[PDB]
C-alpha cells in the first residue's frame, strides 16, 4: 500500500528535499512537476496523484523556527509541494516538552494525510539522532504514531552522531532516542556520519564542505533502497515482506547498508558480490559477525551467473560467521532504472544485521556513565528538571540498552537457546 514519509530536523529536511529531487530526476516528471511524455514505474506509494499535472510527494514537512526552509522555498521545486504544514529546542527533554504542548495540531496534520489516502502501509521517519530540533520531537511523534496505529509499519532513516568526542548532552539524547526506536519502531535503517565522511575523503579531496557531498551519498542510498518498491519486483516489493525476512529476533531491527560504486564522479555477479562483502564498500562502521544478510542487485544481470556467484562465496570461506540458525545469506534481483542517464550500470545493495554496531552503542553507554559520575554535564534545564525530577528515566533507558547489549552479545554466539 501507500507509504507516508515524515521529515524533521534541518538536516533531515535537507536530505528529504534532496531525496525528492533525486526521485523527480527518477520519475516521469519535470522539475516544475509537469508530466513528461518520454515514459514500468509506479508513482503511487510516495506521490499523491491528482490531475493537477504536479504530482505531490507524500511528505509531511514539520519544523521549528524555519531557517533553511526559506532556502527550500527559493527553488524550482516550490511548485512540487505546498501542503501548508510549516510551523514555527536544545535537549531531548526540552524538545520533548515542546512537542508535548503542540501535539494536537501536528497530529491534525498527520490525520489529514491519513484521511487523504485510503490505503496505508507505513511511515518513514527522516530524523537525525541527538540533532537538537529533531531530537525529543521526533521521539515524541514516534511514540504517538506507534501508539495510535498498531496496524501499520514504522521505518526510520537515521544517521548516527559521532565526532570522536563538542556536545556534552548527546549520550543522554541518543540513549533515550535509542530506547524509543527499539520500542516504538519495527525497523531502523542505521547510518553514521563517520564512515561516510571517511569514504568521501577517500573518493574526493574534501575537508570543509563535507555536508554537501555526504547528502548526495545518503540520497543515492535511500533511492537505491526504494528501487525495489517503486519499480515492481516480485520479492519484498512491499515493506512488510521486506522487513519480515530481516528480523530474526524482535530486539534486532538495525540494518547495515553498503553500495558497490564507491565513486561514480564488464561485470559478472561474483565480482560485485565479492566487492560487496568488503568493509570499505560498507557504509556503517572478539568475534563480531552478521546474523543474516540480504543483498539486492540492480543492473544488467544474467540469471544463471547469480547462482554461480553465490556458489563462489560458499567456496571462498568468506563465510566466517556463525549464528544459531540456518537463516542464511539472501540474494535478490531488481532492474536498473531507465529514463535517466545511468552510469556504472550494475550496482549493488546490502541489508544486513551486524553486531559490530553494538560497539558504537556501548561508546555512548560508556560516555553517559562517566558524565553520570561527574554530574556537571546535564546542563540542568528547567523543563528538563520538571519533566523528570530524579532523572531515573535515563537510568531505566540505560538498563534497557544494557539488556539490548547483552542480547546482542548472546545473538553473536551459536548459543541462543537460553535468553541473554
Amino acid at each position: 500500500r501507500e507509504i507516508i514519509t515524515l521529515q524533521l530536523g534541518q538536516c533531515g529536511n535537507q536530505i528529504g528535499f534532496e531525496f525528492w529531487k533525486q526521485l523527480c530526476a527518477e520519475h516521469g516528471i519535470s522539475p516544475e512537476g509537469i508530466v513528461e511524455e518520454f515514459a514500468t514505474d509506479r508513482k503511487d506509494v510516495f506521490f499523491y496523484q491528482a490531475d493537477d499535472e504536479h504530482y505531490i510527494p507524500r511528505a509531511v514537512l514539520l519544523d521549528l523556527e524555519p531557517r533553511v526552509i526559506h532556502s527550500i522555498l527559493n527553488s524550482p521545486y516550490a511548485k512540487l509541494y505546498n501542503p501548508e504544514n510549516i510551523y514555527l529546542g536544545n535537549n531531548w527533554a526540552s524538545g520533548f516538552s515542546q512537542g508535548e504542548k503542540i501535539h494536537e495540531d501536528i497530529f491534525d496534520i498527520i490525520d489529514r494525510e491519513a484521511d487523504g489516502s485510503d490505503s496505508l502501509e507505513g511511515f518513514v521517519l527522516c530524523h537525525s539522532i541527538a540533532g537538537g530540533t529533531g531530537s525529543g520531537l521526533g521521539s515524541y511523534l514516534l511514540e504517538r504514531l506507534n501508539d495510535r496505529y498498531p496496524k501499520k509499519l514504522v521505518q526510520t532513516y537515521s544517521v548516527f552522531p559521532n565526532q570522536d568526542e563538542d556536545v556534552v548532552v548527546q549520550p543522554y539524547n541518543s540513549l533515550l532516542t535509542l530506547k524509543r526506536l527499539t520500542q516504538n519502531a519495527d525497523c531502523v535503517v542505521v547510518l553514521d556520519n563517520t564512515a561516510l565522511n571517511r569514504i568521501a575523503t577517500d573518493r574526493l579531496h574534501i575537508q570543509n564542505p563535507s555536508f554537501s557531498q555526504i547528502n548526495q551519498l545518503v540520497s543515492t542510498i535511500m533511492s537505491a533502497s526504494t528501487t525495489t518498491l517503486r519499480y515492481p519486483g516480485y520479492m519484498n516489493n512491499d515493506l512488510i515482506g521486506l522487513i519480515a525476512s530481516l528480523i530474526p529476533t524482535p530486539r534486532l531491527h538495525f540494518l547495515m547498508t553498503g553500495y558497490t560504486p564507491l565513486t561514480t564522479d564488464k561485470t559478472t555477479v561474483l565480482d560485485v558480490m565479492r566487492r560487496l562483502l568488503q568493509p570499505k564498500n560498507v557504509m556503517v562502521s572478539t568475534n563480531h559477525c552478521y546474523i543474516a544478510i540480504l543483498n539486492i542487485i540492480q543492473g544488467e544481470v544474467d540469471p544463471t551467473q547469480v547462482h554461480k556467484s553465490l556458489q563462489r562465496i560458499r567456496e571462498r570461506k568468506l563465510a566466517n560467521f556463525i549464528p544459531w540458525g540456518p537463516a542464511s545469506i539472501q540474494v535478490a534481483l531488481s532492474r536498473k532504472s531507465p529514463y535517466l542517464p545511468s552510469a556504472h550500470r550494475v550496482s549493488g545493495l546490502m541489508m544486513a544485521n551486524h553486531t559490530s554496531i553494538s560497539s558504537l552503542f556501548e561508546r555512548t553507554c560508556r560516555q553517559y556513565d562517566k558524565l553520570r559520575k561527574r554530574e556537571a554535564f546535564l546542563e540542568q534545564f528547567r523543563k528538563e528538571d520538571m519533566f523528570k525530577d530524579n532523572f531515573d528515566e535515563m537510568d531505566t533507558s540505560r538498563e534497557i540498552v544494557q539488556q539490548l547489549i547483552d542480547e546482542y552479545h548472546a545473538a553473536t554466539r551459536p548459543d541462543y537457546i537460553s535468553w541473554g
Binding site: 498498531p150 519480515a244 525476512s245
Partner: protein
Amino acid sequence: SILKNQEDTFAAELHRLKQQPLFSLVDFEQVVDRIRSTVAEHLWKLMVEESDLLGQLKIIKDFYLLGRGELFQAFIDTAQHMLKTPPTAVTEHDVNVAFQQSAHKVLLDDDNLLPLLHLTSGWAALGLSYKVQWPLHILFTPAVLEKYNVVFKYLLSVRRVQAELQHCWALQMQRKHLKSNQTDAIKWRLRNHMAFLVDNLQYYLQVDVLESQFSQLLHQINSTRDFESIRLAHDHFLSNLLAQSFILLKPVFHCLNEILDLCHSFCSLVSQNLGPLDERGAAQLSILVKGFSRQSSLLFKILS
C-alpha cells in the same frame, strides 16, 4: 509477398522435373527446400513485426506466468469467497468484475479486456483464458494455452500461501509490542521462519526458471528468419517450464503440493489464534511440527 513474384521460377523447376526420364531424390529435395525457405520466411516476415510477436510474449509472461505482481496481489486481497466452494451461478461473473476492478487500481487504462476468468475451492477451479489472434498467430494453438494454464494455476497456489505467511507475521509488530509476555508456549520454536524458507527458496528458483529461457527465446527469434525454427524454440521453451517447475508427475511434485497444504494449515492456526492467548492450540501445533519434520526428511531424498 514475393510468392507470386518467384512463382514462375518454382513452376519452371517442377515443369523441368516432369520432363526428366528418371526419379532422383537429389533434385526433388532441392525444389521442396527452396520453396520451404521462402514460404516460412513469408510467415516470419508478418508475425514478428506487424503482429508484434516479441511484444506479445511479454504480455503472455506478465499476465500469465505471473510476470506481473500488482494484479495478482490486489486480486487475492479483494477475493474472500474463492476460498469457499462456489455454486458457479454468481461467482463466474464476479471474478472477472473483480479482475478488471483490481486492474484499474494503478494504470492499466489501456485496454486489458481480452482475458476472461472462468470457473470449472474457487482458486483450484479458477482459470484464465486468453484468446489470441488466430490468422495472425498460428504458433499459439489451443494445446499451448492448455499447457500454459497448468503453469498459471500452480503458480497461483504458491502466491496465495506465501502472501498468507508474510502477512501473518506480526509477532514483532503487535504481539511483543509494548508487551512483556512470558513466552514458553507463545513461542513455537519460531518455525514461521522455516516455513518461509521452503517457500522462499523455490521462489528464487522460479526467477531463474522464467528468466533464462525468456531471455533466450526473445533472442533466437531475432537470429533466424524462418518460422519453422521459432516453432522448435517455442516447443523447447514450454517443456523447460514444465520440467523445471517440477509439474511433471513425480513423488517430488506430490511432496511439493503437501508442503503447500501444510503451510496453509500453519497459516490458518496462526491467523485464528490472535495476539497472546491459549485456545488449546497445542494439539494442532504438535501435529503440525511433527508433520513438518517428517516432510523435511522427505526433501532430503533429492539432496542425496
